Ligand binder design. Structure first.
Ligand code: PLC
Ligand code: P1O
Ligand code: P1O
Ligand code: HXG
Ligand code: HXG
Ligand code: D10
Ligand code: D10
Ligand code: D10
Ligand code: CU
Ligand code: CU
Ligand code: CU
Ligand code: CU
Lengths: 382, 236, 382
């Protein structure tokens, strides 16, 4: 919900999310929904964005309508920030537990230590039930099961109310007598030295001693109870395992890419060389959360969001099967209302008119090749 | 008569209006108010922004102009009892200014913090800012200017000169409103983060300090109160 | 001597020193002791420690009880700071010449430009003789042999004493007359203009001219003598050659690692898969300068420090030979008094409860495999 505002070229060239899947579309309170997929870090990382040396796999949602039970980057849990390598492909997995009823647009996002949020595709997930049913039980290493929704709430309330009452008692004790104008006049006209006299000093000594003693005894009591504590666990986690993808057998060279201003279409000319030993066909072009598909080649069955999916948004001038060894040049037009709805046409406002995307080539057997393209994007007006 | 029931209205108008504003933003925060490019956002928050800016400009003009036009020309021939009444009215104005300062600089500003930690920033005109930067800040600016003008035009102590602590108390908090330019510039160019303690926010901090001139202002109002109606009782 | 205070997790995951050797344990004055070994830079470099882009191979010792004659990282001399690559293994060598009699705990350490000192194992080396016998002869490119213990000492003393005497002469010349109270009263009561009169101005002119002339003539004389000088040689040395270690044929996956609080033992569960064509056996676990050995598999003969060596501190639930291709899960307990003496149990105080270490697998023929492990370390209290 925070995208459609970021620079179109930044959205095009930061991180490409693909193979995304959502376990459920409608969940009850306390039920779990799992978000899986792969994200690829673009080689041409924009220079004003710091390299993802410190990155956090976040969830884009309107507050804790879900609680992030687990999140994985490469199979291992990542509660802290992680280091990602430019050009690598990682598979991720986020597990969410429903907490608040309603229709929530859940995004998979990545936060970078020096570049801000990289928001992936968002899917509407419906939560049904009541928030009062939500439970977050946690078992500690000391052998007690607590509910994280209300654990320590009473203690926090008690201590804050107690200290507030102490401060209010101090102020009220001094506020029983006249406060501002008589005291100002007494201080002004000659020495004051009458507005602070015993037992006011005794009361101040009592307040100071009681405050120090109460703090010390409360700390000692909170040491006896909860004798085992650990500091906050933090620190960037290195060694994120990337995916060992096979080298693509398709080489694509982009010879110019243009988009009409105004318009909802992007046109590019590609020289595709088919290596390997299978006839391939271009089936999908993904640029920035928007998937332009050729329905004659590939159909989406993973429940991708409708506003981001163009079922027939990809048109190839010659999409006949490309025999192995054969190289041909085709005109590829990616046209959908999403190009303007998500402001990919606002790249004309950007100070770097360059695009990046993913091309998916499918053979007869159905196995697919992921080839990555990037080129300058030239607007056309006349 | 002296202190009359204008104090009750001064508290109640701010309380009721800001409770309604809080209800409005709790209703339209999500659901037409998350996406800044949806048509419903334009009708529920951009229209709010336009209406509130126009109403604030009109109200400021009307209030300040009326206070300046009804200014007391013959301040010399003013009875001490009427001076006490006017001092109490100015204290009511200061109470209203304090209430507005609370609502603007604490409630809606830390509420802007809730939003600036829970959702991805989408524009310079999110609901939170519209309710804070362009509603509550102008409201307390209007109240402070009105209090200063009333003091200068009705109280002989605050006449024959511009009070420095009063001017600082009135203008420094106002400087937070043009400081919004630093906030937006410091959030889009500087600091690709949502750190609430970033140096991009010290502009509010610097000009939030100038509200400490309320101490000099209040001792000045105490002296104005204790001009003729000082005693006796006090210091005797 | 500066370790046992650094965070246990930082000591566990910065740099792993192994294959360490000391040429001599007791040396006479002017005798040479050589420290060799290999250090491996951990892949999961802690984020608050800067990457070893600028690192210096230092020696941990109580001052110059030895002089560092030579130090090598990869066979070549490294008098300056060097650049190390995370994940690489380097062999080092330090040559020390005995200078001061006594028992010295000599450590091999590495200083990082943004993370401070990484102290390796320390060994007690005894120096016998007298400090008066120590010599540090150096031959210069101008053809003169000088002793670095006292070279230029007389010249330094002379020049500093001369300039101090000049300053003292100035102050004393002004201090012959009354100093403070009469002069203060003369300046206060009317114009002073009597306390500074010729030939005081002439003396000041003489002092100024003599100072400038002496500085100029001394610089000229120090230019004539020593006509050949070079600036201080400095600059980080890149291109440190790392060791080309063969890829390990043992793959170890750590399934949980726990340590009792309080306790002197660390327990972990490992799934060891033996590739290659030789039956292997786990013989050593090195975590942070502490070597837990299985005496039935491996025995130390390099004179490792006794306080850091656990001859039978490593117990494996099933340490029978692991046939090639076979994978098995074993419970490994690393127990020694060193775990508490060197405060490896203080990792509970650390904000990152993760450990790293080295496992050494030996086959029947005796050749060994170095496999590196790292995992979260979970304290156990109940
Ligand atoms: C210092 C001088 C300050 C000047 C600025 C004042 C700003 C006022 C609010 C702007 C509203 C806007 O712009 O929006 C107009 C809104 C849009 O809501 P709607 O879609 O019509 O839904 C139905 C309306 N509900 C959602 C509010 C129920 O509708 C309206 O007409 C109603 C606006 C009522 C404002 C007056 C009540 C304030 C609380 C009572 C104590 C004073
Ligand atoms: C919707 C906006 C309504 C604002 C109404 C403003 C009322 C007019 C201001 C004003 O002049 O005085 C109102 C009261 C009572 O003071 P008055 O005596 O009426 O002021 C003049 C003094 N004089 C009679 C001796 C010449 O003085 C007060 O204390 C009134 C305080 C009102 C709170 C400030 C509201 C500002 C919101 C932007
Ligand atoms: C925006 C940032 C403000 C900058 C701060 C500068 C003002 C600080 C000093 C100050 O307030 O004094 C101006 C007068 C007080 O009386 P004086 O300054 O003595 O002069 C009165 C004659 N004058 C009204 C033309 C100025 O006060 C008034 O007369 C104000 C009431 C008249 C203005 C009403 C019209 C404004 C509608 C928008
Ligand atoms: C001194 C500042 C008081 C701020 C109280 C506040 O923000 O109230 C809104 C909140 C809203 O929660 P709730 O009462 O449950 O009503 C929800 C209505 N909306 C969502 C519109 C706020 O609770 C109330 O309205 C209580 C009334 C307090 C009067 C001083
Ligand atoms: C009164 C104390 C002011 C200290 C300023 C400060 O903390 O700045 C941190 C920042 C370091 O940037 P960093 O915290 O790394 O920002 C990370 C996020 N990005 C890269 C998007 C800015 O340094 C600057 O850019 C210069 C600040 C000038 C102050 C007058
Ligand atoms: C001057 C007051 C110092 C208080 C020190 C208390 C120490 C208690 C140790 C648990
Ligand atoms: C990246 C280093 C930033 C240093 C900022 C220093 C601020 C000092 C203010 C006087
Ligand atoms: C005012 C004194 C300047 C002295 C300059 C001396 C230059 C000597 C060149 C060797
Ligand atoms: Cu969304
Ligand atoms: Cu990519
Ligand atoms: Cu030591
Ligand atoms: Cu290592």
């Amino acid at each position: 919900h925070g995208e459609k505002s970021q620079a179109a070229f930044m959205r095009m060239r930061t991180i490409h999310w693909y193979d995304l899947s959502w376990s459920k579309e409608k969940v009850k309170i306390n039920e779990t929904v799992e978000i899986k997929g792969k994200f690829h870090v673009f080689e041409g990382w924009p220079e004003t964005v710091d390299e993802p040396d410190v990155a956090f796999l976040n969830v884009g949602m309107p507050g804790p309508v879900f609680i992030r039970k687990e999140s994985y980057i490469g199979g291992q849990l990542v509660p802290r920030s992680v280091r990602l390598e430019i050009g690598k492909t990682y598979d991720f997995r986020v597990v969410l537990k429903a907490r608040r009823p309603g229709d929530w647009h859940v995004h998979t996002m990545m936060n970078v230590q020096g570049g801000g949020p990289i928001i992936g595709p968002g899917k509407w997930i419906t939560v049904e039930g009541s928030m009062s049913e939500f439970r977050n039980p946690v078992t500690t290493l000391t052998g007690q099961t607590v509910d994280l929704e209300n654990y320590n709430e009473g203690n926090t309330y008690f201590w804050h109310a107690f200290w507030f009452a102490i401060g209010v008692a101090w102020i009220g004790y001094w506020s029983r007598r006249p406060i501002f104008i008589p005291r100002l006049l007494m201080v002004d006209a000659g020495r004051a030295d009458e507005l602070v006299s015993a037992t006011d000093r005794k009361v101040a000594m009592g307040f100071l001693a009681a405050t120090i003693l109460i703090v010390v005894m409360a700390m000692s009591s909170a040491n006896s109870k909860y004798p085992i504590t650990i500091p906050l666990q933090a620190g960037t986690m290195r060694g994120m395992k990337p995916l060992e993808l096979p080298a693509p057998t398709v080489s694509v060279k982009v010879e110019d890419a243009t988009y009409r201003v105004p318009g909802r279409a992007m046109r590019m000319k590609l020289t595709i060389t088919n290596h390997g030993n299978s006839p391939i066909r271009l089936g999908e072009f993904y640029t920035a959360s928007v998937r332009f598909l050729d329905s004659d080649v590939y159909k989406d069955t993973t429940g991708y969001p409708e506003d981001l999916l163009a079922e027939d948004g990809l048109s190839v001038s010659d999409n006949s099967p490309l025999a192995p060894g054969e190289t041909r040049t085709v005109d590829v037009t990616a046209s959908d209302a999403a190009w303007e709805v998500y402001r990919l046409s606002d790249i004309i406002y950007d100070p770097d008119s360059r695009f990046a995307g993913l091309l998916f080539f499918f053979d007869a057997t159905g196995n697919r090749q992921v080839v990555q393209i990037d080129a300058p994007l030239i607007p056309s007006f006349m | 008569l002296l202190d009359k029931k204008w104090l009750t209205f001064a508290l109640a108008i701010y309380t009721v209006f800001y409770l309604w504003v809080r209800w409005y933003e709790g209703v339209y925060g999500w659901s037409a108010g998350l996406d800044s490019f949806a048509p419903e956002f334009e009708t529920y928050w951009m229209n709010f922004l336009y209406t509130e800016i126009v109403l604030e400009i009109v109200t400021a003009s009307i209030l300040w102009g009326y206070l300046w036009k009804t200014r007391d020309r013959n301040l010399a021939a003013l009875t001490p009892r009427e001076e006490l009444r006017r001092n109490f009215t100015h204290l009511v104005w200061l109470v209203a200014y304090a209430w507005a300062i609370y609502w603007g600089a604490s409630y809606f500003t830390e509420q802007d913090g809730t939003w600036h930690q829970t959702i991805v920033r989408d524009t310079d005109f999110t609901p939170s800012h519209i309710i804070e930067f362009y509603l509550s800040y102008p409201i307390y600016i209007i109240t402070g200017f009105a209090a200063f003008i009333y003091a200068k035009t009705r109280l002989p102590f605050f006449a024959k000169g511009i009070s420095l602590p009063y001017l600082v108390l009135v203008v420094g908090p106002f400087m937070i409103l043009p400081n919004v330019g630093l906030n937006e510039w410091g959030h889009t160019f500087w600091f690709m983060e949502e750190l609430f303690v970033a140096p991009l926010h010290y502009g509010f901090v610097i000009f939030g300090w100038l509200a400490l001139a309320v101490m000099g202002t209040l001792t000045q109002t105490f002296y104005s109160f204790a001009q003729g109606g000082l005693g006796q009782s006090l210091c005797e």
